[PDB]
RNA sequence: UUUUUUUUUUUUUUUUUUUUUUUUUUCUCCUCUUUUUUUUUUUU
């Protein structure tokens, strides 16, 4: 599944690939997806130093 | 000489029922005068 802002495909797939703001969007609410999460992996950790998105 | 990112129109449907017009009041109440009562009869 792809949860990018301008393309939404198969939002119920086993594996979801999304931008970072989507993760906090589904973490503010319950969304009943956290119960079945085994691995969550980050691809670019060097944005902790980002001046506007860190 | 001005880049990068910020999801979207609630889920559900394959439940049983053996009655019958109406419907419920109003009180006792001084009748004036020629009479017995005439009468057959025939022409429809």
UniProtKB/Swiss-Prot annotation:
Q: This protein's superkingdom?
A: Eukaryota
Q: Coordinates of motif DEVH box in the sequence?
A: 43-46
Give its localization.
Nucleus; Cytoplasm
Q: Mutating residue 44 to Q: what's the consequence?
A: Abolished helicase activity
Please give the subunit comment from the record: Component of the SKI complex which consists of SKIC2, SKIC3 and SKIC8. Interacts with HBS1L isoform 2.
The disease tied to this protein in UniProt is:
Trichohepatoenteric syndrome 2: A syndrome characterized by intrauterine growth retardation, severe diarrhea in infancy requiring total parenteral nutrition, facial dysmorphism, immunodeficiency, and hair abnormalities, mostly trichorrhexis nodosa. Hepatic involvement contributes to the poor prognosis of affected patients.
The Swiss-Prot or TrEMBL record describes its family as follows: Belongs to the helicase family. SKI2 subfamily.
Q: Which function does this protein serve?
A: Helicase component of the SKI complex, a multiprotein complex that assists the RNA-degrading exosome during the mRNA decay and quality-control pathways. The SKI complex catalyzes mRNA extraction from 80S ribosomal complexes in the 3'-5' direction and channels mRNA to the cytosolic exosome for degradation. SKI-mediated extraction of mRNA from stalled ribosomes allow binding of the Pelota-HBS1L complex and subsequent ribosome disassembly by ABCE1 for ribosome recycling. In the nucleus, the SKI complex associates with transcriptionally active genes in a manner dependent on PAF1 complex (PAF1C).
| Full protein name | Superkiller complex protein 2
Give the species this sequence originates from.
Homo sapiens
Its organism's taxonomic lineage begins at:
Eukaryota, Metazoa, Chordata, Craniata, Vertebrata
**Underlying gene:** SKIC2
Q: Which region of the full protein is contained in this chain? A: 381 to 434 of 1246
